Design a protein around this ligand. Structure first.
Ligand code: GSH
Ligand code: GSH
Ligand code: CA
Ligand code: FE
Ligand code: FE
Lengths: 241, 241
């Protein structure tokens, strides 16, 4: 019954993670947009001293999100929020019950966070070479069950962790967003359409088809427009190797 | 009943995490050292295709660790292993039961992984300036309960995740091991002895005092000798300015 407020931003894949999990949980929750990269409100460090989105408050009196209460628990870091939502809503089965299948979910989240996420960041924001990102995506694809299904078989928070980033990749590439070279843009678009990546394309389709994605996605073109507000995505700048 | 085998290396803080959790769980398990950085056995990709330590096998027939069975589950990534051990040994209370306290543990692990570990890597492997690492350590220290205790209050896997790295910092600095300059080494040693970092010193003491640390630590001098075998620590080498 305790209130949940998620501070969010449309462009943010980290915040998208948590919206997906809250949808899958059937939770009652409030979202509040924060212009974190261009105009952070003076009160925002009260809900997250790290000054990052997402931020979550839990419990305390019901208050407007721009008047946060000292009495609410302040939860930081998207993957911590994913596990928190799974803990709060056990009947929603946001993780498997079998320990080995649960470990597949945790391993998948760690493979993404430790080896793929930084490659997405460095290719898009710094224009580093795309081959290491493609190699990391092929590795992550190899962790998926071959015949279909989600990271741990049944849908779990591991898939909430990963789909926000994979789903942005395709329309960002088509719109030319990112500081990578033309050559690497072509390389990535060809690779992600090639037979090499058939499995991860099916994974993306399967994740996007769920109501939790549809109800937390602004649409491809709208998400592209939101990403254009990110200052680090300096239009007209490209890096070459 | 199902066997646990942890592939290990004395120098490795990631492997150390899992040894600590297994000790706290009261698990029966085998450890098997792998010279992963200098002489990886040809069979090791069968237990971890990423070619990283730690690796874990679970279940399957009892076999010599250098003859791994296809029937065992292959678990990768140290933090996934920590959550796995918590799942396997619920009576050991390796996480709190309260959702908010559990989220404190998950947040603390994410703070370390996302903001602290990479600063340790920059300073120790590249010799970049120490101030950003000291700032990240002060942030992590600020997430501890100021009056005492572990990251989530009671001891949890969050403390298994973090103590291997903090516990290596002090003896490595005393040995001058790492690519930072003598000047930054003195700066870090002075800072870590100052009142600024009294709370994290108490944390390191409290974690080290537990049998799970004593039984998984070779001793300060011995751990330093094992770290000198790590190629990227480049023993005898330092970068300046
Ligand atoms: N590790 C965080 C990453 C969050 C993150 O970096 N969020 C961005 C927006 S997509 C942000 O708030 N950036 C602001 C900053 O770093 O100052 C998580 O998993 O929640
Ligand atoms: N994300 C991994 C990191 C493991 C790791 O990097 N292990 C090192 C030893 S400290 C290793 O095996 N390095 C060999 C390599 O990267 O190729 C985990 O949490 O287990
Ligand atoms: Ca596979
Ligand atoms: Fe972002
Ligand atoms: Fe290492």
């Amino acid at each position: 019954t305790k209130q949940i407020t998620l501070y969010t931003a449309t462009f943010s894949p980290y915040a998208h993670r948590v919206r997906i999990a809250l949808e899958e949980a059937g939770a009652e929750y409030t979202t509040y947009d924060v212009d974190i990269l261009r105009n952070m409100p003076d009160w925002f460090p009260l809900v997250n001293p790290l000054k990052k989105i997402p931020a979550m408050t839990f419990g305390g009196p019901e208050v407007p999100p721009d008047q946060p209460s000292p009495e609410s628990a302040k939860i930081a870091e998207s993957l911590a929020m994913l596990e928190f939502i799974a803990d709060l809503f056990p009947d929603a089965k946001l993780l498997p019950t079998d320990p080995v299948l649960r470990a597949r979910a945790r391993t998948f989240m760690a493979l993404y966070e430790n080896y793929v996420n930084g490659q997405f960041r460095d290719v898009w924001f710094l224009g580093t070479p795309a081959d290491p990102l493609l190699q990391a995506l092929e590795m992550l694809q190899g962790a998926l069950p071959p015949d279909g299904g989600f990271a741990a078989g049944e849908w779990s928070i591991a898939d909430a962790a990963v789909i926000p980033f994979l789903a942005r990749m395709f329309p960002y590439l088509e719109a030319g967003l990112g500081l990578y070279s033309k050559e690497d843009g072509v390389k990535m678009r060809k690779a992600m359409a090639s037979e090499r990546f058939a499995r991860i394309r099916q994974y993306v389709r399967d994740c996007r088809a769920r109501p939790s994605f549809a109800n937390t996605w602004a649409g491809d073109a709208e998400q592209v427009e939101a990403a254009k507000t990110v200052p680090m995505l300096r239009v007209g700048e490209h890096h070459h190797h």
